[PDB]
Amino acid sequence: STGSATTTPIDSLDDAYITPVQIGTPAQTLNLDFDTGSSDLWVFSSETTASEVDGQTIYTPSKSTTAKLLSGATWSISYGDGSSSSGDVYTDTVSVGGLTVTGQAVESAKKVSSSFTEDSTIDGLLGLAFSTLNTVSPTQQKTFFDNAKASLDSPVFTADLGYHAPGTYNFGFIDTTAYTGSITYTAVSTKQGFWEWTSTGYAVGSGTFKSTSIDGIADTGTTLLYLPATVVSAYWAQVSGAKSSSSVGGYVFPCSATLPSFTFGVGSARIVIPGDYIDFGPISTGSSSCFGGIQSSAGIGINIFGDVALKAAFVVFNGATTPTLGFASK
């Protein structure tokens, strides 16, 4: 089997992407944030504290003839950005782009943090990291991909995120029309439960390539590119007037700037992030200070190849017995 679904930016900045997901019988379609940095499929629901729901579409398990309470199971998650959610668990039928999993754990939120409430466009998350990170207790649950894998034509999914435009998540096949040149594959460590890999270096603009190993995670659920402070300083040094602002929470730059590109290495291959991808707009409405899309990972404890990086590539998440990651230009 295969699946193919369009993923759509939630706003003009590509702050996140939402993908429609069918849950239950009859289908209830919710727009979920596909997150290769976590491993829980959780939704706003009829059980979510009413004051914490503000415009989201909810899953109502009592209206699904295929829903079953997973008795005794609870979940609770906290994300790198400080947001969180928790609740109980149902199993139900879940379909993405025509690919169906029966008995998928659907984690129903009883509580969500303010950041989730305040974002009316995201109805929940669909985790695509390794199932070892799933938070369901006392019986850990499998991700949608893990459940689908054996049925797929090939045990893979691909992320093709657009810049200021829709893109595609495919399951079970590689669309050879969706990228240019060849796909370069690179080793993955699953030891921390992430799609963790090592970039071979970087360049700023038309500058020379610096060969240096940068360990990090491919994370579709993180907006920005978080890299070591040395790398980030080298990038912003090429933008007149750019500075790190403790008050704002990262590098800012004059909105009048033209940003240089940023290149990262994948083996001997190179992925170029155009300068425009690195612009996250005014820090507040009407400001001439703009927020940068490349930020320091210092104090996160891990480098993160978030959407800023991934949307410059066609990315293969290869879930074979020994997982790997593939990157192509597009």
UniProtKB/Swiss-Prot annotation:
EC id: 3.4.23.22
Transcription regulation found in the keyword field: no
Stretches assigned to coiled coil: none
MF term (GO), any: aspartic-type endopeptidase activity
UniProt KW Transferase keyword: no
Disulphide linkage map: C255-C290
Top-level EC class: hydrolase
Transmembrane feature ranges: none
GO biological process: proteolysis
Superkingdom, taxonomy of origin: Eukaryota
Active-site residues, record numbering mapped to chain: D35, S199
Peptidase A1 domain location: 17-328
Reaction equation(s) it catalyzes: Hydrolysis of proteins with specificity similar to that of pepsin A, prefers hydrophobic residues at P1 and P1', but does not cleave 14-Ala-|-Leu-15 in the B chain of insulin or Z-Glu-Tyr. Clots milk
Keywords: Aspartyl protease, Disulfide bond, Hydrolase, Protease, Signal, Zymogen
Family designation: Belongs to the peptidase A1 family.
Protein name listed in UniProt: Endothiapepsin
Species for this entry: Cryphonectria parasitica (Chestnut blight fungus)
Gene name linked to the record: EAPA
Residues included from the entire protein: 90 to 419 of 419
